[PDB]
């Protein structure tokens, strides 16, 4: 999860957003959890 | 690698071309 | 003399000086000004204050003829465009509309070399 | 262009015209008229134009420069012959009427193709057309100087006039020299560029060919006496002793037409460079 | 390059049997026809520099096929040569 202080040459799959906001980080983690769950359900 | 050998070759080629430019007229007078 | 209700204005603001020239919708200029004419010279011509002074001088010269509303046409980059627009709008003239009429060469004439300094 | 071999000193770098595009080797007996050399002497018998003397006698090969008549009558080219008095080959027309005439044979004029004069003619190299009907921007040659006066501009080989934008009763022409002239639109013009473009690159090699063409030697004034040329001889190789001046005392100045002539048609002279 | 009829007729004329596509003689005939077409194309456009390389490649393939047929059966090779008018 990158921000204004990340390196695009280092990160390959940039996921912009914000990591300082606790609520934003929690929502992003929930979204990632839902995504991995929808990916697992296919097996 | 480095540029030492390249600079040496450049200097040698430049001196050779200067000598050729200087002796062009004499070479032409001899080869005419 | 003549009378003109409204017209256009052209702001050629290069990296050295700003030339403001007001004209009629036909294309006949009647009042122009610049930093070189207002007093600045050399590098002092490429400044926002000199551009504002030239713009206000042009606005005064146009009001002396009877111009009230102008449509602004700014040119290529250069510090003093917004400053000249503000000076024109504050000297007692209406901005009306603003357009950036900049010549964009589509890879036309080859530009000069690059500065090595 | 055919370059001769360096067999003798007279053929070191000599060249000649390939003579391509020429079908017949003889002219039309009915369109041949006599003409004798003059050696540059006017009616008074005195040598007027220097450097003109012995040369191979030639025929006239009458060429119609007006083409005012035979508008709706087409004509197919028969042969492409050589003309000594001209700089480019000539073309023999076989008019559908029955008569034959000669043309300057512009570039790209093959044998068998048909041309058609008149106002309703198509824009193609070879046929005549009035400037009023010729669209602006095309290329023409040997058009005229006055209505029905005859072709007088761009008649040499490889040269051509550029018809710029016309306006009113006048059309603008750019000459091969670069001059911008104006001519009344009522003038008949020939479309296409003159043929024999390879001309002007022939190396004569020796003085024999120029002497056969009728060009005598030319003596420079520096090697003459003060009584013959302003560039006095002196004692040694002199550079002239003064500014360059004609043998009759005329300096290398404008020497143009008299002041205030009937030159209202010209709008821009040529450039010196 | 070649249409579906001008090529089908050449195949039927220079083939070994019915529905014979790719035989030595048929391939050589097709390569010769393409070589003539490319030679005319180059005579029209004498500064291609790519059609010339293609022509050289096709000529190399034709030479390889000719060598193969000559090493296999000299009779068929000479027959094809006399029928096509090469060398």
């Amino acid at each position: 999860i990158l921000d204004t202080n990340c390196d695009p040459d280092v990160v390959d799959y940039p996921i912009p957003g914000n990591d300082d906001a606790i609520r934003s980080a929690a929502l992003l983690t929930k979204v990632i959890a839902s995504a991995v769950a929808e990916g697992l359900q296919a097996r | 690698g480095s540029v030492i050998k390249k600079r040496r070759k450049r200097m040698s080629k430049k001196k050779h071309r200067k000598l050729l430019r200087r002796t062009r007229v004499q070479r032409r007078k001899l080869g005419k | 003399k003549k009378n003109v209700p409204h017209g256009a204005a052209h702001i050629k603001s290069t990296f050295n000086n700003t030339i403001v020239s007001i004209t009629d919708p036909q294309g006949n200029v009647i009042a122009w000004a610049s930093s070189g004419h207002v007093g600045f010279k050399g590098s002092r011509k490429s400044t926002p204050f000199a551009a504002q002074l030239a713009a206000e001088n042009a606005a005064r010269k146009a009001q002396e003829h009877g111009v009230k509303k102008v449509d602004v046409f700014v040119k290529g980059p250069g510090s003093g465009r917004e400053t000249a627009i503000r000076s024109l709008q504050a000297a007692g003239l209406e901005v009306g509309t603003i357009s950036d009429v900049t010549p964009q060469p589509h890879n036309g004439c080859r530009p000069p070399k690059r500065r090595r300094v | 262009i055919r370059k001769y071999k360096p067999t003798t000193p007279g053929r070191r770098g000599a060249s000649v015209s390939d003579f391509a595009e020429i079908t017949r080797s003889t002219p039309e007996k009915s369109l041949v008229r006599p003409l004798h050399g003059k050696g540059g002497r006017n009616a008074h018998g005195r040598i007027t134009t220097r450097h003109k003397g012995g040369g191979h006698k030639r025929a006239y090969r009458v060429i119609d420069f007006r083409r005012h008549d035979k508008d709706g009558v087409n004509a197919k080219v028969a042969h492409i012959e050589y003309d000594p008095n001209r700089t480019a080959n000539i073309a023999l027309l076989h008019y559908l009427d029955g008569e034959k005439r000669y043309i300057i044979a512009p570039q790209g004029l093959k044998q068998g193709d048909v041309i058609e004069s008149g106002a309703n003619a198509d824009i193609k190299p070879g046929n005549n057309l009035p400037l009023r009907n010729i669209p602006a921007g095309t290329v023409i040659h040997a058009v005229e100087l006055r209505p029905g006066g005859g072709a007088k501009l761009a008649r040499s080989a490889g040269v051509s006039i550029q018809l710029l934008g016309k306006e009113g009763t006048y059309a603008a022409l750019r000459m091969p020299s670069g001059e911008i002239r104006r001519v009344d639109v009522r003038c008949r013009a020939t479309v296409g560029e003159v043929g024999n473009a390879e001309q002007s690159n022939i190396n004569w090699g020796k003085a024999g060919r120029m002497r056969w063409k009728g060009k005598r030697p030319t003596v420079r004034g520096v090697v003459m006496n003060p009584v013959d040329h302003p560039h006095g001889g002196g004692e040694g190789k002199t550079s002239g002793g003064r500014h360059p001046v004609s043998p009759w005392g005329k300096p290398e100045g404008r020497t143009r037409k008299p002041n205030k002539p009937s030159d209202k048609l010209i709008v821009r002279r040529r450039r010196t460079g | 390059a070649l249409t579906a009829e001008q090529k089908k007729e050449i195949l039927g004329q220079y083939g070994l049997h019915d529905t014979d596509t790719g035989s030595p003689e048929a391939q050589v005939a097709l390569l010769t026809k393409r070589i003539q077409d490319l030679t005319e194309h180059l005579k029209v456009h004498k500064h291609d520099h790519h059609s010339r390389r293609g022509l050289l490649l096709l000529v190399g393939r034709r030479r390889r096929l000719l060598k193969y047929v000559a090493q296999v059966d000299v009779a068929r090779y000479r027959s094809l040569i006399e029928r096509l008018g090469l060398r």
Partner: protein
């Protein structure tokens, strides 16, 4: 395909950035505007990269593999711990 909306993405507050000295000069591919000294992030490129990463994760889980988390700050330790205990996946707090 789209799973999250820009409305929710903006209501959550996932567009703030760092100060002037803590900015990456090479981030010209994602910066859109600078309001009140805060670098604003784009939305369309982010939505596209989200789908790209979704496809990547789908292919990864199809081939066989889970996602492992990591964290060191003292502001989301319990959050990540609960998420991990719920989803059955690695985590470090």
């Amino acid at each position: 395909m789209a799973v999250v909306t820009m409305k929710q993405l903006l209501d959550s507050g996932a567009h703030f950035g760092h100060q002037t000295r803590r900015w990456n000069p090479k981030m010209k591919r994602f910066i859109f505007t600078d309001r009140n000294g805060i670098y604003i992030i784009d939305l369309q490129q982010t939505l596209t990269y989200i789908d790209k990463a979704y496809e990547f994760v789908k292919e990864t889980v199809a081939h066989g593999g889970t996602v492992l988390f990591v964290g060191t700050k003292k502001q989301a330790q319990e959050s990540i711990a609960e998420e991990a205990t719920r989803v059955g996946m690695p985590y470090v707090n």
